[PDB]
Amino acid sequence: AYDRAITVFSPDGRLFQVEYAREAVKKGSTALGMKFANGVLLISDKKVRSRLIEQNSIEKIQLIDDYVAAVTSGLVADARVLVDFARISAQQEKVTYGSLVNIENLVKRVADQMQQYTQYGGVRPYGVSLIFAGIDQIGPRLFDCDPAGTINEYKATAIGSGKDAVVSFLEREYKENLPEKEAVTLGIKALKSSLEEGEELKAPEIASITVGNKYRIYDQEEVKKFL
């Protein structure tokens, strides 16, 4: 009915095509991000499809530069095209202005690219949500972006399948300005609260930055110390 084209509003004024692209997000792995004292971190679960897969390869935390990073959920091909568009857009802003002063406009350029395909006929939306995390001259920023293009800046969030559960746990347990170790411990407990018990958390990815430093990926052993 009002259903099979991106350019058709419903009689209540909804785009069901966009919300179906939002339903595409819920099939991905759970990732979270949170602000802490002078910094911000990202944590991400992974589907380990088999034992023949490379571990040290396609990773759910992706760097956008040395001062913006991002995680994705949804269609992985769309998500990779998005992360590469974000990298090219960040480098264009660096050529134009010498530096990236606000992460928010990098998020805005990615989100306007996503909004542009919820409007013109002959394209489909992007079935991906993203979380951006980094340091800019305002401070630590943390965003999400969705198939509609809606931008939200948070203290903490998740995306993916277990998103609600993780959000609910943070809806009881998150405090500002934690030290980095306590913040990661809270994040790992949050990610465990989204699993269905019996099923146990294999080694996730964690990235973090503090103000005045560069990027920092936890290797697997440092992650094992919190499991």
Binding site: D3, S10, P11, D12, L15, F16, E19, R22, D146
Partner: protein, 218 residues
Amino acid sequence: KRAALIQNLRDSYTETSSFAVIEEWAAGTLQEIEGIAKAAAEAHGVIRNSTYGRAQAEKSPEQLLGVLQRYQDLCHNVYCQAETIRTVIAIRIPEHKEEDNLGVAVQHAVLKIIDELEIKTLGSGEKSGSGGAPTPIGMYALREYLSARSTVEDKLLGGGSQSPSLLLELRQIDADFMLKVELATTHLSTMVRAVINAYLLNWKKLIQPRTGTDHMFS
């Protein structure tokens, strides 16, 4: 107040009532159907090895009356519990819109096969439809037995009739209605397992047919 009335309806028949009905169907009801089928098979084995005279038209066999009455009570319990599931689903059909009808289509798809369980399988109506009665016997098996038996008993007793094929038709009515109990219990087992499967797969949309946040609207 209107929302108070809707809340009183939906608190009257929650999901736990229908799921308790599904627990009763998976545990006890199928065993009861199998037991009725075994009683029908034993009675049909008794009838198959018998030769009837006039004296069998002078009394009604109480074994067949017990089997048919047992099957009638079974179909009564199945119809009432199916109506309980039907009411639990039907009091949650949302506001009628020309959109967002995934869960509404799930609800109509489950109500259609509950209608097939009630109408086409239990035969719980006055008259069968133009599609006929695809059930071998209905809700009112025992009245059909007593009526079709009483016509032949009237023809045999009366001077009574001298047709031997009438006397064999007496035995054949007895055997055929036990056979109808066998076939109807088998088809009722199939329909009950189909309803159990559809409910246990679709109950999340049966209870909440329309979810969804206005994320985009602020």
